[PDB]
Amino acid sequence: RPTFYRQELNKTIWEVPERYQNLSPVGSGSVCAAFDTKTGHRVAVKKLSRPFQSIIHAKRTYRELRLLKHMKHENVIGLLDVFTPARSLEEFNDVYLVTHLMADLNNIVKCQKLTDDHVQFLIYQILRGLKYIHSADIIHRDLKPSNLAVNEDCELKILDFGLARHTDDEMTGYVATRWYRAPEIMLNWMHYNQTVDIWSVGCIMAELLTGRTLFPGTDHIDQLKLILRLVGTPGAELLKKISSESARNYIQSLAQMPKMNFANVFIGANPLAVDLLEKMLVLDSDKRITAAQALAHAYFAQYHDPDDEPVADPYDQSFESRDLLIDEWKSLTYDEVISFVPPP
Numbered sequence: 076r077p078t079f080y081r082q083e084l085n086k087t088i089w090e091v092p093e094r095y096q097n098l099s100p101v102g103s104g105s106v107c108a109a110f111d112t113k114t115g116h117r118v119a120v121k122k123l124s125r126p127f128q129s130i131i132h133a134k135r136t137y138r139e140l141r142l143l144k145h146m147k148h149e150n151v152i153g154l155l156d157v158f159t160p161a162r163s164l165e166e167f168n169d170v171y172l173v174t175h176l177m178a179d180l181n182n183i184v185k186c187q188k189l190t191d192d193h194v195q196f197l198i199y200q201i202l203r204g205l206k207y208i209h210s211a212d213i214i215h216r217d218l219k220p221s222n223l224a225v226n227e228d229c230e231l232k233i234l235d236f237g238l239a240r241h242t243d244d245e246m247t248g249y250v251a252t253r254w255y256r257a258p259e260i261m262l263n264w265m266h267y268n269q270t271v272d273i274w275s276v277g278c279i280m281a282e283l284l285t286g287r288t289l290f291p292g293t294d295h296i297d298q299l300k301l302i303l304r305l306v307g308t309p310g311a312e313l314l315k316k317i318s319s320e321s322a323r324n325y326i327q328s329l330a331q332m333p334k335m336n337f338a339n340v341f342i343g344a345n346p347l348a349v350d351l352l353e354k355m356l357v358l359d360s361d362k363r364i365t366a367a368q369a370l371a372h373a374y375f376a377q378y379h380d381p382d383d384e385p386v387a388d389p390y391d392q393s394f395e396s397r398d399l400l401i402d403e404w405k406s407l408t409y410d411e412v413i414s415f416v417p418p419p
């Protein structure tokens with residue numbers, strides 16, 4: 076067990092191993108930047124807030140730690156360390172997580188002129204990471220520019236997996252928290268699957284090409300109208316698949332519209348980029364291109380290498396259907412903290 080030291084940073088006590096030095100608050104869990112004397116990296120350290128206050132929160136803590144411990148891919152966040160100052164399960168109350176210190180895609184999109192070559196490389200990396208994530212039967216659920224980290228050499232990592240914690244108020248009005256969401260989950264039409272992430276990638280790619288949000292709706296209904304004007308109103312095949320009669324009823328109240336011509340929307344873009352967007356932004360989720368299929372599209376010809384696009388080890392999510400007490404979720408979490416093995 077390493078030696079820990081204590082300090083108070085913006086009204087929060089931080090108790091961390093000596094290896095982490097020069098802690099500096101970055102945002103409010105709370106996150107601090109630090110220097111890691113063991114690896115020599117600048118790192119981000121996140122202290123979870125009230126990790127075991129309720130059954131829902133305790134299960135959410137376990138979910139985040141299980142996800143981060145599994146991810147071992149160049150284009151996905153990796154866990155450098157996880158620690159607690161507690162010396163036994165009985166005094167266990169705090170969880171700290173450590174990763175490489177990150178700019179996001181929001182900054183470079185608003186501040187830079189991106190060539191088509193930049194768009195190719197950035198979207199290629201998102202899809203390479205998504206192929207890995209989806210191969211473990213994980214759905215991200217919350218892909219958007221602020222959850223994509225980018226460095227000076229245009230290298231990209233996916234982070235901030237959806238933990239099923241975003242509330243209805245967080246998604247209300249003219250907000251980027253909703254602009255990248257698939258239509259079928261924005262209104263809870265259906266039991267969704269991994270195809271919702273491909274819709275988000277299409278929204279991000281459009282924004283890189285034009286510099287503008289694709290579907291900046293002022294509320295849920297305005298956003299649906301913007302979406303259907305581009306991709307067309309649904310046919311009877313897709314309407315069947317909508318379980319709620321209430322949502323089926325509302326859709327049929329709308330005047331029918333055909334799909335627009337994407338070459339006249341995305342004026343001047345690479346024709347291969349337009350073709351890929353048409354295959355991502357399909358209303359019927361069964362018919363969208365998958366991440367593995369998209370990596371083989373001709374738009375990525377200068378980067379695609381099928382011997383260097385790896386898949387993930389299997390990921391057991393049976394805990395998600397399990398009903399446990401707070402102390403039982405807490406003990407499962409403690410076991411995962413103490414068994415952590417750092418990367419090479």
Ligand SMILES: O=C(NO)OCc1ccccc1
Pocket residue numbers: 106119120121139143152172173174234235236
């Ligand atoms: O991506 C996630 N959770 O899914 O957290 C990001 C993160 C992890 C560790 C330290 C700071 C920030």
Ligand SMILES: [Cl-]
Pocket residue numbers: 077078092093094095
């Ligand atoms: Cl130490």
Ligand SMILES: [Cl-]
Pocket residue numbers: 159160161166167168169170
């Ligand atoms: Cl503790």
Ligand SMILES: [Cl-]
Pocket residue numbers: 181219220221222251
């Ligand atoms: Cl964003």
Ligand SMILES: [Cl-]
Pocket residue numbers: 329330331
């Ligand atoms: Cl009509």
Ligand SMILES: [Cl-]
Pocket residue numbers: 389390391392
């Ligand atoms: Cl597993």
Ligand SMILES: [Mg+2]
Pocket residue numbers: 221222235
């Ligand atoms: Mg985020």
